[PDB]
Symmetry: C3
Subunit: 355 residues, 3 copies
């Protein structure tokens, strides 16, 4: 049993090589699963299978649209002659996994609106281009792309269609125009505890708590530190939402924890080596990202758009561009970013080489 | 006759030298005409004369304001000691040609509102500065400026004034707040065919189909491939507008084809060498730019602004920053970008040098 | 007396060294005062004391919140191991001075709303991070950060809270939806003359004319050329507001002169060496910044936000990125930027070295 566990954990490098030998259809399936799991920074195909099972538990229509987005984007990246090493780590399929899931989430035509498969494909062909263009700009300065391709594609689509499109109408994004009445005596501790997996689930747009638990299980299969930081970031988003007197139904829905969950995953050991200083910095980034999330939600509601994960991308890029003279606050080279355990081993060896 | 034709086609280099010898007033007239024609990437003074005739066919007031914008911007670039080689190719006068035409298009005071000549001049003095600043930023990474100076100047002006300015009121940009009723049985094939020149005309803000035909004739005088790609991009914008169930009156007005016309001109042989792969990529950029055009139109209608050619600039910069490992998808060096025929000859010679 | 005057003018380098010898609490007080004064580009602790006296003349609650912002941001920059040379010149405390003053200005809970000290601190801990991140990006290309950290922090906060927050409600930013009735016969020359110090005061959000006079006195203590350009930029903003038929009550309140005052300070001898050409360019930047100020005010009123000093930052970055071939339009190296008198001496010596 421990052999199989070590085989299915981390990034699954042994299977990656074994499939490099295998036919290209199996490799394509592998790239699709890694692209599904890469939404939570996880480059693991079994984590991708678990995340797909969680999406099917939420809504099979969303799983279908998201898997089709992943497939169309990986095929489009193959057609555009992109780096095969980036395609095989699923880095050309996760933005379109998100595009496909959240075009169905933000759709006003209900489940199994088959015509929606036409814009899905369309926007899933724009995600490699986005992913390529940004990966140029941001790799000049050794910065990750994050989910900026998904965010640009979805903002473009939801602006192009809107609520009043005769073909593909979107959900109505309403700005707030009256103060909410919060009854602090009706606050549930159980619902606040349940909001921790629901924010991890809302990373994919899924309000199911079982879906969020399955996503946390997938992240834990890849790296336990990633799971810890996902849970902690969702909790810190809950805390920020309570600090701004947000409606409890928005915290219970997990809308306050998914951006900060992603930001705590990214900062806590992933793109910054894991020390206690970078752990505290990841907590600060999670709180900052929750507050920027409500800021961008309120601001983009005015133009009829959802904030999505714009807050995570902007806040995490801000915290990665930030420089300190602290040697224990170390930004990982993008070429050596695998998962927090290996990242920490690499950082410790480099810190020994520094002394 | 063939000698004169070869003399008036392309970029007219022979006249450029002959005028380099001539007095500076004739050279200034040449730079003004090249700045007029440079709105459609054409560095030809006779094309500029034809485009000016088309503008006079549309509206002589718009021709006056646009020509005055060109003059003021070229004089301002001379005063700011800008590169004379950029001034003499009209690259300091086309953004202000657009500023001057579309300050009168988007004006709520009617034709021959003489006071409008005061903000025109003002904004036409901002277009060299814009053009200079951006040309710094974007030439670090060998990227064209496009009509970003015009877009920033016009967004700034139409925000500063707005619909309720007592002096210079602008047109009211209304967001959509109800679903349009489209009667697909009333769709005209003749109006859809006529919308192809009207999008090329709307490149300058002109809804006349004769003006669009004259603009296509000017582009054809410069380079037939540019004319082909202008027409094809306007057609692809028509197609995208039909695919999103747009009101037919917006497709007939050419609002769906001018951004994609510009994007197909830029990508189809101009800033990317012309192969069949880059032709298909230019078709994809034209479609993407039509969809981003309706997206940005809907989004900027919320802040009371028109999208203008923000979609063309953003989408074409995105497609130029994109990298592939395809050798036949070749991005032209900005120093060697003349017009698609010479660009293709240069690319073929460089590809022979590569082997 | 002249010895003391020479001791308290400029940047006060002698005191900076003498305090480098002194205990760290006195040095921290010095850094706080320099961070207060650095809002008007002044690196002088006695100017900071005078600006603090002006803030107390306006509103002691705003002085308290702004001083606490400065303190929290300087301590946070110390904790984040930022450059001590930047911390000691007050370059990590002025954006939070602004954050603290204008969180109380834009607050809907009145004076001495003690709970406001909690978000103040919070946003004052975000200003070093902002300041650090941007100072990375913008120092690659030798550009000043300006008040972009303050603007990002305040936009984020005022979006996160808004007018309808149950805890920290903000002021209601209303868009214009009807044409203002201006009675040009009721225009006061005395109020227009008084609007010159009120725009300098509104640099900090203060509508008191005595506060603006005290701020001009502080700037004059540092550098008389800075005071001259502050007054001239506020006047040019008055002129632009009259040219766009703005409501007189907005010009009298100083909302038209503070962005252009900052832009004339920055361009007139500060970040560009002071020649007569750069003086005229600073006048042009002041006018451009007034017009961009009303543009961004009208545009950001649509999303419920104030423009603040976004216009100053964007317009001054645009005018600094602009390149000319004029040798007498010289951009100062950021490492040699002290105050216009020393900047001009440095430029004259470098121009002798150029010949
Ligand atoms: C790639 C291209 C995507 C396919 C284009 C559109 C799907 C097929 C046409 C849609 C259509 O008219 O058929 C459905 C018939 O009604 C029904 O609901 C009957 C269901 C049968 C429709 C076909 C089922 C699968 C079609 C897609 C292929 C799967 C590929 C993966 C419409 O359904 P509706 O859109 O009105 O839905 C209702 C919920 N709003
Ligand atoms: C460069 C500076 C531009 C010039 C500043 C403004 C133009 C002259 C003042 C405008 C003015 O009051 O004269 C017009 C008198 O009425 C009329 O309509 C009479 C027409 C005569 C006005 C002058 C004709 C040309 C003036 C500009 C010089 C040309 C330079 C090129 C106003 O007209 P209006 O603005 O109310 O228009 C009506 C359509 N809304
Ligand atoms: C750093 C952390 C900042 C402190 C957190 C909040 C301040 C203290 C709690 C606030 C509180 O409930 O006390 C006040 C009691 O009422 C009063 O107005 C009584 C005034 C006494 C309150 C305490 C005075 C200073 C507290 C802050 C410490 C100073 C550090 C610098 C509320 O006042 P309110 O907020 O309703 O104001 C009214 C104008 N809207
Ligand atoms: C909630 C929002 C609005 C603001 C977010 C602020 C955070 C980004 C701050 C708050 C607490 C800060 C932390 C407080 C304490 C430390 C320990 C500090 O460690 C040291 O300086 C000790 C000596 C050494 O490590 O060598 C390094 C910075 C760090 C992690 C800080 C990183 C930045 C944090 C997370
Ligand atoms: C409509 C919107 C929402 C999406 C726009 C997608 C386009 C950018 C795509 C769709 C079709 C694509 C084209 C489909 C086929 C090809 C041929 C392909 O050629 C090869 O790979 C063959 C071998 C070789 O050229 O060496 C190069 C990419 C290209 C031009 C593609 C470029 C990108 C295009 C235009
Ligand atoms: C009001 C808004 C909408 C537009 C703002 C335009 C300004 C940026 C322009 C208008 C006047 C211009 C100035 C007009 C005259 C001159 C003198 C000129 O000096 C020379 O060329 C003389 C020879 C030499 O200096 O060697 C240098 C540019 C400058 C300062 C210009 C700088 C740019 C200015 C300030
Ligand atoms: C493996 C790492 C992560 C493990 C954490 C697993 C957390 C999953 C627990 C979710 C429990 C939610 O519990 C159930 O949620 C559903 C929503 O469909 C509610 O139903 C509404 C039920 O009333 C509630 O009991
Ligand atoms: C919420 C509670 C969760 C706490 C979990 C903390 C996870 C990361 C913090 C610790 C990371 O690893 C820590 O790195 C620093 C390096 O500076 C080491 O030193 C510590 O010995 C080690 O514990
Ligand atoms: C040279 C390359 C390009 C050549 C293409 C030329 C296309 C120009 C054809 C435009 C024809 C428009 O035709 C006319 O348009 C006017 C609008 O003013 C309509 O009038 C409304 C007429 O009913 C219609 O017949
Ligand atoms: C719509 C219909 C318009 C079609 C016109 C296509 C214009 C550009 C496509 C062809 C460009 O030129 C093409 O370049 C490729 C290079 O890979 C050459 O090989 C082809 O022989 C040549 O035809
Ligand atoms: C030292 C360099 C700068 C020196 C310039 C000093 C200018 C300061 C003069 C401000 C005078 C304002 O004058 C007073 O303003 C107050 C507002 O509180 C008005 O009261 C309303 C008074 O009716 C008006 O007389
Ligand atoms: C064009 C293809 C491309 C996509 C993303 C990146 S990248 O720069 O973003 C990035 N480089 N390494 N890397 C990245 N992205 C990850 N996860 C995806 C997500 C980001 C935000 C939310 S999920 C993970 S996981 C292990 C390593 C990495 C670079 C190139
Ligand atoms: C900080 C509070 C907050 C943040 C973001 C959004 S929001 O504007 O993003 C958004 N508004 N409605 N809404 C949104 N987000 C969703 N899922 C999370 C996402 C995952 C990836 C992209 S969205 C879902 S699921 C059903 C409705 C919605 C709204 C509120
Ligand atoms: C500051 C002056 C300046 C303006 C534009 C550019 S630039 O970088 O934009 C560009 N460099 N070469 N070049 C460009 N622009 C063209 N056409 C103008 C239009 C662009 C978008 C719509 S029209 C054409 S036509 C033949 C060659 C070119 C660079 C510098
Ligand atoms: C994709 C559909 C669409 C795109 C852009 C615009 S739009 O927001 O640009 C605009 N809204 N009204 N309007 C606009 N565009 C015009 N001409 C095109 C231009 C040339 C260069 C800059 S604008 C004219 S002409 C008379 C009215 C208008 C509106 C709709
Ligand atoms: C991260 C800390 C940091 C803050 C600002 C700058 S910086 O790049 O902005 C700048 N570099 N030098 N310098 C600057 N800023 C000044 N004034 C502050 C204001 C700017 C706009 C309005 S007040 C003055 S005054 C004398 C020299 C300078 C660089 C680094
Ligand atoms: C060109 C005209 C104009 C410019 C900016 C703003 S505005 O949107 O900035 C703003 N709207 N209300 N308001 C604002 N600005 C203030 N002070 C100036 C500042 C200093 C630093 C940041 S704000 C104050 S003081 C009390 C109310 C306000 C409004 C109008």
């Amino acid at each position: 049993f421990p052999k199989a566990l070590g085989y299915v954990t981390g990034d699954m490098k042994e299977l990656a090589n074994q499939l490099k030998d295998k036919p290209v259809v199996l490799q394509f399936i592998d790239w699709i699963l890694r692209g599904i799991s890469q939404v939570v920074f996880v480059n693991n195909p079994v984590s991708g299978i678990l995340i797909l099972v969680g999406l099917l538990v939420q809504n099979p229509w969303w799983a279908l649209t998201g898997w089709l987005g992943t497939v169309v984007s990986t095929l489009m990246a193959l057609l555009l002659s992109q780096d095969r090493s980036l395609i095989a780590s699923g880095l050309y399929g996760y933005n379109a996994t998100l595009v496909g899931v959240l075009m169905a989430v933000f759709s006003d035509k209900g489940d199994y609106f088959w015509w929606l498969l036409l814009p899905v494909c369309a926007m899933s062909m724009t995600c490699p281009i986005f992913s390529s263009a940004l990966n140029s700009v941001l790799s000049k300065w050794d910065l990750p792309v994050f989910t900026l391709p998904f965010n640009m594609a979805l903002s473009m689509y939801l602006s192009a269609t809107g609520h009043y499109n005769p073909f593909f109408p979107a959900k109505l994004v309403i700005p707030i125009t009256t103060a909410p009445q919060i009854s602090w005596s009706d606050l549930s501790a159980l619902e606040l505890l349940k909001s921790i997996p629901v924010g991890v689930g809302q990373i994919y747009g899924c309000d199911n708590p079982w879906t969020g638990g399955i996503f946390l299980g997938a992240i834990l299969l890849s790296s336990p530190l990633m799971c810890l930081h996902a849970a902690i970031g969702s909790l810190l988003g809950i805390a920020a939402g309570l600090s701004l007197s947000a409606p409890f139904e928005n915290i219970y829905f997990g809308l306050w924890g998914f951006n900060s969950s992603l930001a705590c995953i990214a900062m806590g050991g992933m793109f910054m080596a894991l020390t206690w200083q970078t752990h505290l910095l990841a907590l600060g980034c999670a709180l900052f990202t929750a507050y920027l999330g409500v800021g961008m939600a309120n601001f983009m509601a005015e133009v009829g758009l959802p904030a999505c994960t714009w807050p995570f991308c902007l806040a995490t890029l801000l915290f990665l561009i930030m420089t300190t003279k602290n040697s224990n606050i170390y930004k990982m080279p993008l070429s050596k970013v695998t998962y927090p355990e290996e990242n920490r081993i690499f950082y410790l060896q480099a810190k020994k080489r520094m002394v």
